[PDB]
Write an enzyme that holds these catalytic residues in place. Structure first.
Site, PDB file in Angstrom:
ATOM      1  N   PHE A   1     -10.512  -3.285   0.726  1.00  9.36           N
ATOM      2  CA  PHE A   1      -9.745  -3.256  -0.450  1.00  9.36           C
ATOM      3  C   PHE A   1     -10.771  -3.111  -1.752  1.00  9.36           C
ATOM      4  CE2 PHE A   1      -5.821  -5.458   1.656  1.00  9.36           C
ATOM      5  CZ  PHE A   1      -5.274  -4.337   1.676  1.00  9.36           C
TER       6      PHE A   1
ATOM      7  N   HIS B   1      -2.878   7.966   3.595  1.00 10.04           N
ATOM      8  CA  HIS B   1      -3.447   6.714   3.254  1.00 10.04           C
ATOM      9  C   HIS B   1      -4.360   6.182   4.100  1.00 10.04           C
ATOM     10  CE1 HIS B   1      -3.718   2.673   1.302  1.00 10.04           C
ATOM     11  NE2 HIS B   1      -3.412   2.207   2.341  1.00 10.04           N
TER      12      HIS B   1
ATOM     13  N   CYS C   1       0.853  -1.317  -0.055  1.00 14.71           N
ATOM     14  CA  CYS C   1      -0.035  -0.094  -0.054  1.00 14.71           C
ATOM     15  C   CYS C   1       0.699   1.337   0.096  1.00 14.71           C
ATOM     16  CB  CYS C   1      -0.938   0.071   1.033  1.00 14.71           C
ATOM     17  SG  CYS C   1      -2.333  -1.126   0.839  1.00 14.71           S
TER      18      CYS C   1
END
Lengths: 385, 385
Positions: A211, A299, A160
């Protein structure tokens, strides 16, 4: 001291264009527990579905785009099992979708950029959705008709944080090569990570709540031609770091049944313990002292970290607005997510009429993370709107 | 025109140190057909062993280092089959060996370099032997005690050209960042590619005659401190190219049973068709006109290409001496092979008493290739011995 310009670029790398794309198919999060437990032939795990219902609500995700339809999973049932040999099938889907999704975002970024494709001299392609040889960087180069002499960097399975790595890489490519124009593509999907549920692997179940699929594409270049090009951000610094005492925090095992995650250590505490000094070091050359005078890209792979960082640095609750919008509307699209957030931040600043691409701020920080425990931190400078 | 040096480096990237390492275990090629067909429980394919005996002789390989012993294959029989689910097992061996082999070469390069490890600011790690998350770049950083803030670029599964990619990447890292010292590691093994024989896949059988294990490590940096550092080569240019009409020439499919190769097009003809103009473009800024006034490094993944290029450009038969030595003594160690050859070329030039690290020549070309069909070409400048 001065050096001859020669073949290098004079000034800092700038983002010159940005765009995103997603698979047409999407799932509303409210519908997902039913869909997931059905297609994985796991409706009998009533108590697990109940946990999943709660996990999915607390993600704050509203929809997620996914290549995987019920039809595709029916024609590939090993993918829907928790653990059946399925890698070749997953990689066949990657070859059919990942370079294609990247091209959808690349077309849009090149359109915004406004220059011909033949001026692209470099390609950085990141994906954790499928290891291909030749890579999706090659396939995209062919699909887009980029110069066969383009300098490509294919980044498989960094996880990621790779959106930060891509900017870190593009920065040196752009700044060291006069005239260089870097197409950056993060194209991601759950093709390796998607699997059925197991009562004995709750970590793996949580990842199925977050996800999602999507691609982001950027043009990065130094020395813009201000008569034809419009910088959106400058990449001022880019650093990578392994956090202390974080061994095996995030592990992803690539197996016969695809990617299986293992998350023993507490990720939110690890970030909270270290975030402040990492961002202080990033901001040190700017002379910024107010955490709220800069714009933010974090993130959102663990939504709890957004709340906790917000509380810790005492952020204005609108600072993480663009970040939370992407999490709500798209979920965690692996390395692409911070680039979606960057584009959303830009679009909202322009739409809301602010003075800079950084919502009126001058400086901004982009922070992502993943296996290591690794943190990628980018110092950004906005541009006047 | 001049630009302020600021945070960048003044001059071109240089190789400052180089070393290699291999697994202790090796196989003489004369013994390999017997060993291979035994451990893969395939002694009944007498006619195939006979083909393999001929393939192994024509490779001109004499020995190959390999992690895989008869003992390890006995404890992992799925690896020895042509096609059985074995990826997790192969990746367990990768985690136990690939970062470790890289450290063996890195220790030796750092020793030759002579500066402390804490001056290494970047790591480029290439492997096609195992997709790990976190990668072997992380594991090596931990094993070596490099700075946790090191800037890493992990390059998984680019295939055999990645030695050229690593130099191409290190060049921009070194030149754009003043003081930067780049540790470059290619650490390779047949852990993903090794499998039993099939009468119906002769391509896969040929790869079992050539692929081998080894690691190469370099220190790359600009602006050497000539009182403590001794450049061995300068990286003058580095370019990547997809050859025309080469779609699907080399494909590597990552499956449940590891890496399976597919080689439909004729690789030697593809290279012969294109090599000359690729090297002419590389040499264009040097004013070289004699193919024999420069030194040579050619990836020896297909030995026939060495003979054919030698004939085509009418090379002195000693030009490819260092290249053929590595092929004979180590086989094809994937992306590491050209870096082994570079080190052998340096060592032979010094030992034989020549005037430059380039066997007395000023300029040199490094050429490798792999999936694409991709060619990586590096223009090197030697240093006075």
């Amino acid at each position: 001291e001065w050096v001859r310009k020669a073949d290098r670029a004079a000034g800092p790398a700038a983002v010159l264009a940005m765009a995103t794309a997603n698979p047409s198919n999407f799932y509303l999060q409210s519908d997902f527990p039913d869909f997931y437990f059905r297609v994985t032939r796991s409706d009998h795990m009533s108590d697990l579905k109940e946990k999943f219902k709660r996990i999915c609500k607390k993600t704050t995700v509203r929809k997620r785009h996914m290549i995987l339809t019920e039809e595709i999973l029916n024609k590939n049932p090993a993918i829907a099992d928790y653990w059946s040999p399925s890698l070749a099938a997953r990689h066949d889907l990657a070859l059919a979708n990942i370079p294609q999704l990247g091209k959808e975002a690349a077309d849009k970024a090149i359109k915004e950029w406004g220059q011909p494709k033949s001026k692209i001299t470099h390609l950085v392609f990141c994906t954790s959705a499928g290891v291909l040889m030749p890579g999706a960087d090659y396939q995209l180069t062919m699909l887009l008709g980029l110069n066969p002499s383009i300098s490509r960097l294919m980044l498989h399975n960094l996880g990621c944080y790779a959106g930060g790595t891509a900017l870190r890489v593009a920065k040196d490519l752009a700044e060291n090569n006069g005239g260089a124009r870097v197409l950056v593509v993060c194209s991601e999907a759950n093709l390796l990570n998607f699997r059925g549920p197991s009562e004995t692997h709750i970590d793996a179940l949580i990842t199925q709540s977050l996800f999602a699929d999507g691609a982001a594409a950027l043009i990065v270049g130094s020395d813009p031609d201000l008569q034809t090009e419009s910088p959106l951000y400058e990449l001022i610094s880019a650093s990578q770091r392994i956090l202390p005492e974080s061994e095996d925090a995030i592990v992803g095992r690539l197996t016969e049944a695809g990617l299986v995650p293992y998350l023993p250590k507490d990720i939110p505490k690890l970030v909270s313990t270290n975030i402040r000094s990492i961002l202080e070091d990033a901001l040190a050359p700017t002379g910024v002292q107010d955490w709220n005078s800069i714009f933010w890209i974090i993130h959102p792979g663990m939504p709890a970290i957004l709340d906790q960082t917000e509380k810790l640095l005492q952020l204005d609750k609108e600072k993480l607005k663009a970040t939370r919008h992407v999490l709500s509307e798209f979920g965690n699209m692996f390395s692409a997510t911070v680039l979606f957030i960057l584009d959303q931040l830009r679009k909202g600043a322009v739409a809301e009429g602010k003075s800079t691409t950084g919502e009126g701020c001058e400086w901004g920080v982009l922070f992502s993370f993943g296996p290591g425990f690794t943190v990628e931190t980018v110092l950004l400078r906005s541009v006047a709107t």
